[PDB]
Symmetry: D3
Subunit: 126 residues, 6 copies
């Protein structure tokens, strides 16, 4: 299952843009969260994308002119990230698969946590 | 503040061991989570450590013979991680610094999520 | 077009095994060539795969038990390599796409050039 | 012998320029090929240089202001590349050594395949 | 002891600046040496700092806008370097720690060997 | 001149062994120094070799089954290190080149400083 040790969610992007994570499907009516994380890098950025406990749905898109792909754990495959919410990259908690899913109706209701959500660009010096 | 874009929490470790994350201070009686994340690497492991929405305390320790340090964003400083829950590395949500705190009172009530919490070892091919 | 500058063919594998290249569709009555290139690496091996002048078809498989993917140029996507001749990774000269093609009818006529064909594992010190 | 598994031909260059490969000594009257491959990198470029089946001579030069060296396999030695066709770097099929050779008599006959010959710059994300 | 095998002195800096080394406490009235080593790198520079035989004191500072840290051997800790001679990073021969020492009284007697002392920036291609 | 900024002395080795430095040609009646620096590494080790102030001769050998080469600054060329004191790699202070020199006559009178001379293996975390 994605997010377990060995099945971590990594993203690789090229050039500048924003990776946005939608955290939703909250247990016990917990509020959905949406936050955009910018990169100004000209080249490749590597990213770690985390879940939050007590949520069952994680959806993400890339907004940038360059490519963006996800990798599961140390798997070799790198597959394109969704580029709009009607064809978002989505994980159902417990799934081993990223699917394409329309989450356009979830986005406006989510609390805005731009630059403070669970997706992180790795620096030059790690 | 740590966990904001630019102040991401990275850990570097040497040799095999377990990084354990205690997620606590949950809003509205959300249950605390404890999970250990193993590595078997003989050398260096790099890690990205995430928060979870709706929690306000994040405590971590390293259990291994080899060193463990944290780095904030692309800062050059690397400082040691705590090695037991009585001297845990702890972050209070909104703080810009890691402190040393005894969280032994929080551990017994935490639900075990070994290999499925918000700390991730970076693989060899990222 | 694959094999042109900017669209070089790279392979990424995990663990030991043989990458086997079938060079075929030769002009000027040229004999097809088949050659297996071994790696003994436990971890990730990166590879550069070249065409040969005067041939119009290039087909390859990974015979190892670990994962294998190809990357075109500095593209981010990495997609699985074929694992049998009936589902080979195949390039038609001039195409920008690696297709899946059955080349079992070509293999028996090819001259064996094991360890001496146009696929190369990159070393640890490049 | 160079181009066999273990004795792969790699180039290292600094700054922008063209690596040009002459493929000649074609069996059965096969047409010699010349093709220049550009790099615009300001720093180091690593390259993989392939042979073509049915040819028995491979000559290459670097036209760039910066340095250029070849490495055989995982050998540590890096030695300078020829900088003109009268002092080309040349491999005789079956040889274990790159020698200096004057191939100006071969170049005029060769068909131009610029940006489409068997020498490849490795990208930033391999 | 620092400068023994396993306890090599490395520095990590960000951005352009100069690292200066004061070699002093020479036996047999050997003259003290001071030399500044510049970098123009915009990003992270890694440095190896050597002692000289027959000296008992080694002091160093970083002059630059960006951060500077030292690391001992393959240890994970990175700690700040001194930024003026009144607060120098200093090693007493045989000591396992870097101390803060005011060596303003030593600096005038030293011979200037800018760009020719025993601290070295590591290049892009090592 | 070797050892000036831009012309730093680096070594690359494969497999386990020892790099030995002989510091001689001392001014001010200084005794010659010899010291072996071992590595246990199975793969490639990178090294920084420093001079000592007040000496004019620096001679080094690699004793190991595996290859060993030197590189000057960020130059691309890598050339073999001497494998015995009768064929040492030698630098005359002020020279821009490494020569071969027999220094067997210096060795017996040199003070032994094994694991404590000015040649350093670079670690995995730099
Ligand atoms: C183990 C796990 O992931 N369980 C998921 C279920 O979530 C747990 O449900 C029980 C109630 O039966 C408790 O509410 C528990 O707190 C829930 O776990 C918490 O939330 C999940 C989503 C994880 O983040 C977990 O680490 C956290 O402790 C869930 O109800 C079902 C269906 O959605 O999925 C289970 O996999
Ligand atoms: C913006 C933020 O991080 N706020 C923190 C407070 O948490 C929010 O509290 C409000 C009510 O005042 C709501 O309960 C809101 O849902 C809370 O935010 C959620 O939980 C926090 C911890 C973050 O994970 C956030 O992204 C998430 O939406 C919090 O009560 C106090 C505790 O000191 O800190 C505030 O910084
Ligand atoms: C430029 C090119 O790639 N052309 C391909 C054609 O191959 C050439 O065909 C001509 C006659 O039409 C000659 O036979 C020439 O030698 C051929 O080029 C040689 O072979 C090709 C496959 C490449 O390796 C090239 O570099 C080499 O010189 C080919 O016949 C057609 C049909 O397949 O494809 C053309 O793209
Ligand atoms: C095995 C090999 O490399 N052989 C070289 C000879 O080339 C082969 O010659 C035979 C005739 O004896 C056939 O014509 C065969 O198709 C030739 O092999 C082809 O060309 C060589 C150059 C390689 O690319 C090979 O993979 C390809 O199948 C060759 O005539 C002589 C000349 O130097 O060298 C032999 O090593
Ligand atoms: C082993 C060592 O570091 N010795 C230090 C002493 O220095 C040596 O002193 C003896 C006389 O007792 C000789 O003069 C000898 O040459 C000195 O060693 C030389 O200088 C030292 C600092 C090192 O660079 C060494 O490699 C070099 O050969 C020193 O006198 C005392 C007190 O400061 O410390 C000893 O550690
Ligand atoms: C600047 C330099 O490297 N000079 C070398 C000369 O060394 C200096 O010689 C004078 C007397 O003429 C003093 O003895 C002085 O202390 C010497 O400099 C010291 O030693 C040299 C080897 C360097 O380590 C230097 O940094 C240190 O201060 C040397 O006499 C001549 C001839 O060998 O070469 C000069 O390049």
């Amino acid at each position: 299952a994605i997010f377990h040790t060995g099945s971590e969610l990594f993203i690789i992007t090229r050039g500048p843009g924003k990776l946005t994570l939608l955290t939703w499907g909250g247990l016990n009516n917990l509020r959905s969260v949406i936050g955009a994380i910018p990169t100004e890098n000209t080249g490749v950025t590597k990213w770690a994308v985390s879940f939050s406990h007590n949520y069952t749905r994680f959806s993400f898109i890339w907004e940038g002119q360059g490519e963006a792909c996800y990798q599961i754990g140390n798997g070799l495959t790198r597959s394109p990230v969704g580029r709009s919410w009607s064809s978002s990259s989505t994980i159902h908690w417990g799934s081993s698969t990223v699917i394409t899913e329309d989450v356009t109706s979830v986005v406006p209701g989510a609390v805005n946590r731009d630059k403070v959500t669970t997706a992180y660009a790795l620096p030059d010096n790690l």
